[PDB]
C-alpha cells in the first residue's frame with residue numbers, strides 16, 4: 679500500500695486525511711512518494727534533565743524537563759516547515775550536540791553505529807526528508823537525511 683512505516687490518519691480539526699510515519703514521526707497531508715548501506719544525516723538535538731549526559735556546549739547543567747524539550751522541538755519544526763527559519767540555522771544556534779558547529783551534519787553512517795531509534799528513523803527517511811520528534815537516550819532529535 680504505502681512506503682515503510684506510513685499509515686493514514688484523520689485530522690481532528692479539519693476532518694481531512696493525512697499520513698503519519700511511526701518510525702520517523704513525520705506527518706504530512708500528501709500521500710508519500712514511491713535500503714542503502716549508508717545514509718548521511720544532520721540533526722538538531724534538544725537535551726533534557728534525563729538525558730544520558732545532561733550538559734552541552736550551550737549549558738553546563740541542562741535542567742529542562744522532557745516536556746519542555748518536546749515543546750522546543752515542536753516549535754523548531756513549525757518554523758522549519760513554515761520557512762520562517764532554516765534547519766541548518768536552527769541547528770547551529772540551538773542544538774545541544776557538538777555537531778551544532780557543523781550546521782548539524784553528522785556525516786555518513788551504517789546500521790549499528792547510532793542509537794537505535796535515531797538509526798531507524800534515519801534509514802526510513804527518504805533523501806531530503808525530515809523527521810518528526812525522535813526520542814533517544816540523548817534527548818529529542820529532529821533528523822534531516824541529506825544523502
Ligand SMILES: Cc1nc(C)c(CO)s1
Nearest residue numbers: 776777779780783784785
Ligand atoms: C558529534 C559531532 N561533532 C562535530 C563537530 C561533527 C562534525 O560533523 S559530528
